[PDB]
Amino acid sequence: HVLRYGYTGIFDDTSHMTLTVVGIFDGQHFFTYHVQSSDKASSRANGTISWMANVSAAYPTYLDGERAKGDLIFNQTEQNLLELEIALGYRSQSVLTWTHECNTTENGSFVAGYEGFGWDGETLMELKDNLTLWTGPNYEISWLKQQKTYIDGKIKNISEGDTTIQRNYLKGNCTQWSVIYSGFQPPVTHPVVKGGVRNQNDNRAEAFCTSYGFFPGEIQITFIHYGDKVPEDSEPQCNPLLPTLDGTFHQGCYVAIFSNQNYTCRVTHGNWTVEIPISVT
């Protein structure tokens, strides 16, 4: 399992800043906290997937809690943005993007952790492995070298005490809420698979095979050629793995074939393999 939180803090004005933080569990976006300096009242904490309704019915004050935590984080975030904009300025956008991740085994035990910050798309500082030593920018390829001594000074000045609490959250509550979230996420959901051939061109054609609504996201889509003749330029190719609102995924693939051959599409998702005819004769 993996419980990940993404924070995007945008600085537009000294009075215009936005923070949108999203929680993602096993690839499913389930939580969002949003707030703008302009309003702040209208700050919100929403479940963003159907199973979060079950979470709320079982923990009635979950959303109010998270929102209070969010309101606080934004306060600190407002200071951090103003401070980086002043000290670093920006090249493309004055945005601070940071994230923390929790890796656990099925049964909930902590396997790995990570906390990372990036400003204007540039890595600023990270915390990995033992989660005790922060690293900094990759000054060899980053415009951030323009402010190296300032950044190194900020990184060197991070206590072992502000750090440990980040580590204990990752090893503590983070792995603990992962177990809870685990009890509510949907069960393995296999794809609806569809395939066929199209765009006939002389003795050539295009075979396709697409998988719809599967979760988890890992999947294997293969064309099985029951024959010997294949075009020279032929090479199977899949579009990227894409998300849909309901927390499931989508993936389509294609291959150049001789309209001649027998092809089927094999799709393996978890411990399940489906096979359908795609072109016959």
Binding site: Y5, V21, Y62, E66, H100, F117, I158
Partner: peptide, 9 residues
Amino acid sequence: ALPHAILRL
């Protein structure tokens, strides 16, 4: 759930 603490930059 979100952590209670943010790093001070």
